[PDB]
RNA sequence: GUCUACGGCCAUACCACCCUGAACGCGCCCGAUCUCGUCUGAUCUCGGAAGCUAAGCAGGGUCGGGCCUGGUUAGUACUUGGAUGGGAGACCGCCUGGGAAUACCGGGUGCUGUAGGCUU
RNA sequence: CGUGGAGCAGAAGGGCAAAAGCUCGCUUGAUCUUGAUUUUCAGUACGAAUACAGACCGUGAAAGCGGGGCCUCACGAUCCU
RNA sequence: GAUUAGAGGUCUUGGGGCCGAAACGAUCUCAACCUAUUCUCAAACUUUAAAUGGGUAAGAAGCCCGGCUCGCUGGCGUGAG
């Protein structure tokens, strides 16, 4: 019902998880952050001090501009149909790295290192992914008994 | 009547304190602010001079910040100054000046910068400046780290900063509490500080109880005899081992003794000894009630 | 009132029902087995709609089952006390009272 | 004042509790929940029998006190008076709201 | 066996509450100078009740902790008052006990009407060695669990030390 | 094996109670002239090193509570999608896919980076 | 004994236990000056807020923190004076 | 936060007591206050906690190399170009 109010219904988002309402941990501000690593924000409660607004909570973009303590962001903001490409500031006890990109990047690592050894074996591997395929044409042993009879249960009455 | 706090619910809605803030080693306000470095710089130590002070020994220490653990740059104490030839003196005011004075020229000896930024011997009222370049050393500045957070005016904490910007770190400080300072004079004088620094106040301790009561007198200073302390050298004995400290500030480790590999405590109880123990306690026992 | 901001204020008190609840449990000796039925077929024409009755298939208004609860209780593991009966888990710090008398 | 409960039988609303926000509700007619020998060791009554609602809907505090009354006044006459426990399981807790109109 | 564990003298807290506010408390205030020989502070008040004349900070009371040599002269000095002697219940439950005198003159000073007649109070903790290590900055933890004392515990020293006994009620 | 300083995870690390102690390692502990601060050298601070491991601390014990992690709870509760499926309704069955949480019963009870000792 | 059961100017929600509470000590960063961004949306302004930069400063040994209130409300165009 | 019920036990009071004197005394007791349980709840409660949901990535704007510039950051380095 209510209108513009820069943190409406935020009683459950900024809440610091249900027992760590502790002080922050150090090693989230002692992360090293670079210009062009995606982050992604969740916003914590305890810093008060530069929180993204809860448009943002759970989005993630590149990062571009780097502060004293506090990192510039590019998202995606959903609007009207259009979507657009904004940037803000957020003090980094809100962001954290992405495992999203990190995990393209050692797949990448053992990409190109097979083709290295393909070049070196003149035989040409599969690249990365190819998607599930469906079951293969396998012998069930059956050595060990009979298959067990399965029958429904007659109904009965538990309140 | 009787009301209980400890209970199944209190315990299910506790909540534990860090591990160093927990049994009262650490205070984490402190820390955060102090041994983080800006991200503009991303990778540049912001190095702590670590001081701590036990009942029995000082301890100085180089370190920063590390995702895992903070990684110690440097380390001296200060009950291996009978290298030097300091023998008594353990938690005084000028055995921490020396081994501050130790750590500052052990740290610019390992990085190679003892031949240029000396300190000076005697006294002083301050620190020593210096030009900063890349690939060759300009500078070497440590952010001081105190104890939790207890500072008064005339603490060994301030005596081992002391120690090391004599032997030559660039420090951020301004002498306001140093031993040699009282707040209603307002200004600093100095030459009680080198009488700290050389414990020249102890010698007329000593002194004072030579002339008013041997008993008391050797009932506080025992081991001092047992050394074969004089007053008078007590103002020469330091500064001849601060001529060693920089002399040699570099350490020359020990050997290992080979291991008893059996003793500390009580390695723990097997889960069919806690399984069965249970057993045995309720059935013999039981079986003897019996008895009876 | 006239619909110029109508919202009602607070009269009577229900509870909501769920398929599967027990809006009532009789306790009684078991000689009594066509009285608890035929007393209790009554409320089924004072509450709205069909309510399904039914003999419980428990010692009484215990969690238990078929009065091998009550062989569990010889065990030991059940301890009368109060209108319903006490559970007893064989955790717990008294291995030396189950040892004097279990 | 009858408001037969036609209109408040289907559950249809967000539950209400007597609250800090509703205040004044009238009291549930019912209040006491338990009738007969309740004071009974569990190792007397060994017949527990049950009463499942087979529908989906609100039942009414007054309703609820006509029902264990009802049910109350056969079972004195067969078992006795200290041959029973009844012992209604549920609780009005949700409120209902009444517009006024002039 | 060994001073380990021997129960000493820990603080002996000395109080008034002369329950107004004018020349009454500086006076009792210098009676406990002239007592101890050392100065006191002041207390005042949490709360208001106007039942027994008090608002909130309305300076009430005169106190002072005493330790070492003092404690057990003046222990001594107020116990001869009551020429050793105390009751069960009043051991609290760790170890510390208390009791009030009413007036100050049999404690050696003269009554002077300058001061009136003015009554103290006697709390005494005891202890051990190394209670201290629960108010300490370094580092701190608990007494231990087997390191305390009580009241049975409190009455040994008291019947043993200044052989007053205790009367049962 | 294990301790010391700084830590990262911040309970498999907490709490309770009992037992055990591989230097002077931490610490208790003895004093207050110097520095300092309190009503109290209790705290803080300084100077010490006679005894002490009684305590903290470390390790262990607990048919311990707690906590973490498994089962049973259950393919139940629940729901994306479908119908000219039932029911007067309240609700409900089915096709298709997803799929929990108590009670209850198991197991576990700190790991570890860094610089520095000792084998009492 | 004491896991926030209290206090944080006021509504409620969030947040806090060597603090963001309580007591002291010192002080005016509640100041001067461009641009950027968030907040409502046409992604106009006002309001409010975010993070940097250039000056003068404050406190603290210092690392740092501070450009109003622990965060979410507490306020205003052309013309004219 | 609301709420039924029994129990097991001392305590703070009360009904009338008694003792004979106050006794909540042994008898009580009735409540209260605990300690283990017990029946039912929450749009403005919550330890847990789905289904359908919202972001990002799934390679040349990439990866590996080599050398300069930087009035910035400063052990030596960093990062940025």
New binding site residues.
């Given amino acids: 019902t209510n209108?513009?109010?820069?943190?409406?219904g935020?009683?459950?988002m900024?809440?610091?998880?249900?027992?760590?309402?502790?002080?922050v941990?150090?090693?989230?501000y002692?992360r090293?952050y670079?210009?062009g690593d995606?982050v992604?924000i969740k916003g914590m409660?305890?810093?008060?001090?530069?929180?993204?607004?809860k448009?943002?909570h759970?989005?993630?973009?590149?990062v571009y501009?780097?502060?004293?303590?506090?990192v510039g962001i590019v998202?995606?903001?959903?609007?009207?149909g259009?979507?657009?490409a904004?940037?803000?500031?957020?003090?980094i006890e809100h962001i954290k790295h992405?495992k999203?990109?990190d995990?393209?990047?050692k797949?990448?690592?053992e990409?190109?290192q097979k083709?290295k050894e393909a070049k070196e074996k003149g035989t040409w591997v599969q690249?990365?992914?190819q998607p599930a395929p469906p079951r293969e044409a396998h012998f069930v042993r059956t050595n060990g008994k009979e298959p067990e009879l399965l029958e429904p249960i007659p109904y009965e009455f538990m309140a | 009547?009787?009301?209980?706090?400890?209970?199944?619910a209190?315990?299910?809605?506790?909540?534990?304190?860090?591990?160093?803030?927990?049994?009262?080693?650490?205070?984490?306000?402190?820390?955060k602010?102090?041994?983080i470095?800006?991200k503009?710089?991303?990778?540049?130590?912001?190095?702590?001079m670590?001081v701590?002070?036990?009942?029995?020994?000082i301890?100085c220490?180089i370190?920063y910040?590390?995702?895992?653990?903070?990684?110690?740059?440097?380390?001296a104490?200060a009950?291996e100054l009978p290298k030097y030839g300091v023998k008594?003196?353990?938690?005084?005011?000028?055995?921490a000046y020396c081994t501050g004075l130790l750590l500052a020229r052990r740290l610019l000896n390992?990085?190679?910068?003892d031949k240029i930024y000396e300190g000076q011997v005697e006294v002083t009222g301050d620190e020593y400046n210096v030009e900063?370049?890349?690939?060759?050393?300009?500078?070497?500045?440590c952010?001081?780290?105190?104890?939790?957070?207890?500072?008064?005016?005339?603490?060994?904490?301030?005596?081992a900063?002391k120690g090391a910007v004599d032997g030559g770190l660039s420090?951020?400080?301004?002498?306001?509490?140093f031993?040699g300072?009282?707040?209603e004079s307002k200004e600093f004088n100095a030459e009680?500080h080198r009488?700290?620094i050389m414990?020249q106040?102890?010698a007329?301790?000593m002194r004072?109880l030579m002339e008013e009561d041997e008993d008391?007198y050797k009932?506080?200073?025992?081991?001092?005899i047992?050394?074969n302390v004089t007053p008078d050298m007590m103002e020469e004995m330091y500064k001849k081992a601060h001529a060693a400290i920089r002399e040699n500030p570099v350490?020359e480790?020990?050997?290992?003794?080979e291991?008893?590999?059996?003793?500390?405590?009580?390695?723990?109880?097997s889960?069919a000894?806690?399984?069965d123990?249970?057993?045995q306690?309720?059935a013999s026992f039981l079986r003897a009630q019996e008895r009876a | 009132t006239g619909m110029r901001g109508a919202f009602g204020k607070p009269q009577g008190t229900v509870?909501?029902?769920?398929?599967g609840?027990?809006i009532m449990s009789i306790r009684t000796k078991l000689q009594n087995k066509e009285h608890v039925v035929e007393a209790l077929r009554r409320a089924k024409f004072k509450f709205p709609?069909?309510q399904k009755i039914h003999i419980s298939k428990k010692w009484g208004?215990t969690?238990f089952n078929a009065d091998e609860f009550e062989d569990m209780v010889a065990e030991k593991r059940l301890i009368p006390?109060?209108?319903?009966?006490?559970?007893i888990?064989?955790?717990?710090?008294?291995?030396?009272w189950?040892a004097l008398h279990? | 004042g009858r408001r037969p409960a036609r209109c408040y039988?289907?559950?249809?609303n967000?539950?209400?509790?007597?609250?800090?926000?509703?205040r004044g509700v009238p009291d549930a007619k019912i209040?006491?929940?338990?009738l007969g020998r309740?004071?009974?060791?569990v190792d007397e009554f060994p017949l527990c029998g049950h009463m499942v609602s087979?529908?989906?809907?609100q039942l009414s505090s007054e309703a609820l006190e006509a029902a264990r009354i009802c049910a109350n006044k056969y079972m004195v006459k067969s078992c006795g008076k200290d041959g029973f426990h009844i012992?209604?399981?549920?609780?009005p807790?949700?409120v209902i709201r009444i517009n006024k109109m002039l | 066996?060994?001073?380990?564990?021997e129960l000493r003298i820990?603080?002996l807290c000395l109080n008034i509450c002369v329950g107004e506010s004018g020349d009454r408390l500086t006076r009792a205030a210098k009676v406990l100078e002239q007592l101890?020989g050392?100065?006191?502070?002041f207390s005042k008040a949490r709360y208001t009740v106007r039942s027994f004349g008090i608002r909130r900070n309305e300076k009430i009371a005169v106190?002072?902790?005493?330790?070492?040599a003092k404690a057990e002269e003046i222990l001594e000095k107020g116990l001869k008052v009551r020429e050793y002697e105390l009751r069960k219940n009043n051991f609290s439950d760790t170890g510390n006990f208390g009791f009030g005198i009413q007036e100050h003159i049999d404690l050696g000073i003269k009554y002077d009407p300058s001061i009136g007649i003015y009554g103290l109070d006697f709390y005494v903790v005891l202890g051990?060695?190394?209670?201290?290590?629960a108010?300490?900055?370094?580092?701190?933890?608990?007494?231990?669990?087997?390191?305390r004392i009580s009241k049975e515990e409190a009455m040994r020293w008291f019947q043993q030390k200044y052989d007053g006994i205790i009367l049962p009620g």
């Fill in positions: 209108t513009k109010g820069k943190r409406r935020t009683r459950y900024f809440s610091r998880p249900f027992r760590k309402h502790g002080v941990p150090l090693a989230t002692m090293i670079k210009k995606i992604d409660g305890t810093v008060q001090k530069g929180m993204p607004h448009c943002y759970g989005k993630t973009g590149r501009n780097v502060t004293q303590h506090a998202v995606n903001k959903q609007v009207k259009k979507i657009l904004k940037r803000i500031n957020v003090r992405s999203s990109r995990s393209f990047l797949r990448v690592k990409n190109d083709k690249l990365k992914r | 009547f009787v009301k209980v706090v400890k209970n199944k209190y315990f299910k809605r506790y909540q534990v304190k860090f591990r160093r803030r927990r049994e009262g080693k650490t205070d984490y306000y402190a820390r602010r102090l041994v470095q800006d503009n710089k991303y990778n540049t130590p912001k190095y702590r670590i701590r002070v036990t009942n029995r020994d301890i220490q370190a910040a590390r995702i895992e653990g903070d990684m110690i740059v440097c380390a104490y009950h008594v003196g353990l938690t005084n005011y000028a055995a390992r990085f190679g910068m900063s370049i890349d690939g060759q050393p300009g500078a070497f500045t952010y001081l780290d105190a104890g939790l957070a207890r500072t008064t005016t005339g603490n060994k904490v301030f005596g900063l420090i951020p400080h301004s002498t306001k509490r031993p300072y009282d707040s009680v009488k700290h414990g106040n102890v007329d301790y004072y008391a009932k506080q200073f025992s081991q001092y047992k050394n350490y480790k020990k050997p290992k003794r291991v008893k590999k059996k003793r500390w405590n009580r390695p723990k109880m889960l000894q806690k399984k123990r249970v057993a306690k309720k | 509870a909501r029902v769920h398929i609840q027990v709609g069909r208004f969690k006390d109060g209108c319903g009966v006490k559970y888990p064989n955790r717990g710090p008294l291995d030396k189950r279990s | 039988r289907y559950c249809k967000k539950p209400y509790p007597k609250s800090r926000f509703c209040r006491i929940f338990d309740k004071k009974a060791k087979d529908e989906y809907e012992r209604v399981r549920l609780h807790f949700h | 066996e060994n001073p380990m564990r820990r603080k101890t050392q100065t006191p502070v106190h002072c902790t005493v330790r070492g051990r060695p190394g209670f201290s290590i108010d300490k900055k370094r580092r701190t933890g608990c007494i231990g669990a087997k390191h």
